[PDB]
Amino acid sequence: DLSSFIASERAIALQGALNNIGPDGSAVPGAGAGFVVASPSKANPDYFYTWSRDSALTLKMIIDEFILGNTTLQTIIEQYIHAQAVLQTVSNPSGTFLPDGVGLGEPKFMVDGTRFNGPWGRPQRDGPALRAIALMTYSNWLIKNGQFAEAKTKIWPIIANDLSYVGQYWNQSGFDLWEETYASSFFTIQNQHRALVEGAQLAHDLGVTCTGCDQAPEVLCFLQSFWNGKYIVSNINVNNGRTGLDGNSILGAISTFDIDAYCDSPTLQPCHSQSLANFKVLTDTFRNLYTINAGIPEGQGVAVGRYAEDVYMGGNPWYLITTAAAEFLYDAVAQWKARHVLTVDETSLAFFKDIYPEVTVREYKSGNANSPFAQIMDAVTAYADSYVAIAEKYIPSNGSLSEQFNRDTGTPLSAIDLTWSYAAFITMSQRRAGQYPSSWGSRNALPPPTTCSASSTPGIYTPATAAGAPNVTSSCQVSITFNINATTYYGELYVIGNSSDLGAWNIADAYPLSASAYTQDRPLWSAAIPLNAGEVISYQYVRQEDCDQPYIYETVNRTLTVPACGGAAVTTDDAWMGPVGSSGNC
Ligand SMILES: *[C@@H]1O[C@H](CO)[C@@H](O[C@@H]2O[C@H](CO)[C@@H](O[C@@H]3O[C@H](CO)[C@@H](O)[C@H](O[C@H]4O[C@H](CO[C@H]5O[C@H](CO)[C@@H](O)[C@H](O)[C@@H]5O)[C@@H](O)[C@H](O)[C@@H]4O)[C@@H]3O)[C@H](O)[C@H]2NC(C)=O)[C@H](O)[C@H]1NC(C)=O
Ligand SMILES: C[C@H]1O[C@H](O[C@H]2[C@H](O)[C@@H](O)[C@@H](O[C@H]3[C@H](O)[C@@H](O)[C@@H](O)O[C@@H]3CO)O[C@@H]2CO)[C@H](O)[C@@H](O)[C@@H]1N[C@H]1C=C(CO)[C@@H](O)[C@H](O)[C@H]1O
Ligand SMILES: *[C@@H]1O[C@H](CO)[C@@H](O[C@@H]2O[C@H](CO)[C@@H](O)[C@H](O)[C@H]2NC(C)=O)[C@H](O)[C@H]1NC(C)=O
Ligand SMILES: *[C@@H]1O[C@H](CO)[C@@H](O[C@@H]2O[C@H](CO)[C@@H](O)[C@H](O)[C@H]2NC(C)=O)[C@H](O)[C@H]1NC(C)=O
Ligand SMILES: *[C@@H]1O[C@H](CO)[C@@H](O[C@@H]2O[C@H](CO)[C@@H](O)[C@H](O)[C@H]2NC(C)=O)[C@H](O)[C@H]1NC(C)=O
Ligand SMILES: *[C@@H]1O[C@H](CO)[C@@H](O[C@@H]2O[C@H](CO)[C@@H](O)[C@H](O)[C@H]2NC(C)=O)[C@H](O)[C@H]1NC(C)=O
Ligand SMILES: *[C@@H]1O[C@H](CO)[C@@H](O)[C@H](O)[C@H]1NC(C)=O
Ligand SMILES: *[C@@H]1O[C@H](CO)[C@@H](O)[C@H](O)[C@H]1NC(C)=O
């Protein structure tokens, strides 16, 4: 059946994703160490960059795939732990890492892990959640499989910063997952709820204090505001002229998936009534929008895009969203079987009447095979198959999943070999089988208070250190090269200043200059010093001497201010202003 030709595409998708990940990635030449590229397409659209969302979302698949079957994925997982451990410290246009921990929200870096200076929709506030959720789903396996040390000592201090970010900044606005609307997004809030609830449980079992986990009830309280009568508005707290119907909604449910949960829960699961009623109106608008969905019935899946007002490269359906729309049904079908009950609410009745004509407002219970409960279950999973069916049509023969496939003609376009779309296909294919990840602890989640309160506890941000080894003394240090004309020996002189990095007026901790390009023509000593930005550093060169002779300072103290964070790599040009004393002979 179709089961064969999606099992083959899953295997292609593994390589498609893995080839985009450095260092040993076939698709990406350049830059490695555990940084996942979204797409190798350097040609427009230029997607040759690492997105902290895409990186953390595709690696969540890799970890969950690693849990069942593949063990060679451990190599790329453990480089990612090193990668993001470093990436944390990288000062970027959103902000620096230390003082308030603002730089973690920056969505996009170079395939290196150097800053992306260009203009962008920042901050995005969801990467920290997905990166926490990724590392928490790996570290909670390590504690279960007799490697507690790694989870506690090295992986945790990465997570500690990322859910400190969520604790401190959930209630301030950001950009949505589509990098467009500067507003409180549903996908961003629902995933960063999970990062506190699941993060609190791992903090408990590791035996450490999660700063930021406090806000889990208040984040869940605010998540109730997104619902809107018939459907769920994805971006709340702005007016951008959009409906609110958005793939954002589906992608939030599938990425915050739990099997032990019931549809009663206020975390808004795939099987929850309001989420089903959204899926109806959301998929029905795309059923009517695109020419591809010309007269497809109400009981059959269709090409799903991101929103009705989408204009990005035509306003098309997306591969990752159309697969996630199937996964949404495969999540819901599993949850009803898991909890053995279907309380079909009148708010969610419009969903079921398409799939099963003779539904009511009953509590359908897990009875016989061929009973009504099983018939609804077998119809919903059949409805899920039609979403992957129409996906299989517009997926090409060689299996190259792009970002989008065209609105009208259905041929592929946009970024070629998108890592998300491969991962989203794998996440879907897992859920077709019984391969569900784990209970992140939705039942143990603290329910929302009586009234919501605007709040955010200020978390603290220590470097990962054990994972990746930056260890930052202070925020955004800029490079500055001292050069000095000093006539002396052609090889084998120091520099001190009022700053701590230089010395603070002592010659034991003074920085030694190298005589690399010293010549008769140009007697240059030099030293590239990474020291703090925005400081009027008062420096002075000094000469160390042979046969235990004392040090010889220059006659005057120089001062030149090092420029502010975010570039301007200055190089000073001084000469020796004082007497070069007596040389040695001993
Ligand atoms: C930080 O957290 C705090 C809470 O901890 C957040 O504060 C809450 O923000 C909510 C969203 O702005 C707000 O909800 C609305 O409150 C007003 C009254 O102030 C209600 O009238 C609204 O209900 C009505 O509208 C909804 C949706 O219908 C449409 O209309 C609204 C605009 O009115 C649109 O936003 C929406 O897109 C829809 O098109 C209906 O479903 C209702 O039936 C009703 O008609 C909302 O509930 C909370 O009141 C507010 N709470 C407090 C205590 O301040 C804060 O926003 C958050 N900030 C960030 C950045 O995350
Ligand atoms: C890849 C991204 O492209 C689109 O958005 C970005 C634009 O391409 C850029 O031009 C830039 O826009 C800024 C203007 O240049 C600047 O003049 C100023 O007005 O600010 C603008 C931004 O506010 O940055 C845009 C992003 O903010 C497109 O709208 C967006 O959806 C695209 N993102 C997708 C790509 C990936 C790849 O990993 C996914 O992470 C996202 O979910 C996708 O939505
Ligand atoms: C487990 O992961 C490995 C990658 O580490 C997969 O290996 C690829 O398998 C395909 C099979 O068609 C080959 O064509 C590739 O050449 C393999 N690549 C490498 C680098 O080994 C493997 O298929 C995965 N297995 C399962 C069961 O998921
Ligand atoms: C696999 O199929 C994809 C379908 O996208 C091929 O990508 C196209 O490659 C050609 C090369 O000339 C480009 O002109 C097209 O623009 C690409 N497609 C898109 C959507 O941009 C890919 O080359 C194929 N790989 C093979 C046959 O090895
Ligand atoms: C990271 O660097 C700082 C200094 O920039 C180190 O801080 C010292 O920590 C030790 C205890 O481990 C204290 O006794 C010192 O007083 C601290 N300050 C200084 C200025 O030395 C810190 O230990 C480093 N961390 C790692 C893991 O190497
Ligand atoms: C340090 O020595 C270098 C020697 O090159 C000086 O740089 C030269 O300065 C002269 C000024 O007459 C220029 O004509 C040359 O083109 C410069 N050469 C280079 C390589 O820069 C420099 O000015 C000296 N600095 C101080 C502070 O005395
Ligand atoms: C270095 O000296 C300058 C003199 O203007 C001063 O402003 C600055 O604060 C000093 N920095 C120190 C002592 O770290
Ligand atoms: C200037 O340098 C001398 C070196 O001995 C030092 O003692 C003095 O404190 C410095 N003064 C300033 C203002 O930098």
Curated annotation (Swiss-Prot):
Residue numbers binding substrate: 120
A GO term from the CC aspect: extracellular region
GO BP terms, alphabetized: polysaccharide catabolic process
SUPFAM superfamilies linked: Six-hairpin glycosidases, Starch-binding domain-like
Enzyme class per UniProt: hydrolase
SMART domains attached to this UniProt entry: CBM_2
All residue ranges annotated as the CBM20 domain in the record: 472-578
One MF annotation (Gene Ontology) recorded for this entry: glucan 1,4-alpha-glucosidase activity
Protein's cellular compartments: Secreted
Active site: 176, 179
Disulfide bond residue pairs: none
Keywords assigned: Carbohydrate metabolism, Glycoprotein, Glycosidase, Hydrolase, Polysaccharide degradation, Secreted, Signal
Catalytic reaction annotation: Hydrolysis of terminal (1->4)-linked alpha-D-glucose residues successively from non-reducing ends of the chains with release of beta-D-glucose
EC number of this enzyme: 3.2.1.3
Domain of life per record: Eukaryota
Residues with glycosylation annotation: 171, 398
PROSITE patterns in the cross-refs: CBM20 (PS51166)
Family: Belongs to the glycosyl hydrolase 15 family.
Name of this chain's protein: Glucoamylase P
UniProt source species: Amorphotheca resinae
Lineage: Eukaryota, Fungi, Dikarya, Ascomycota, Pezizomycotina
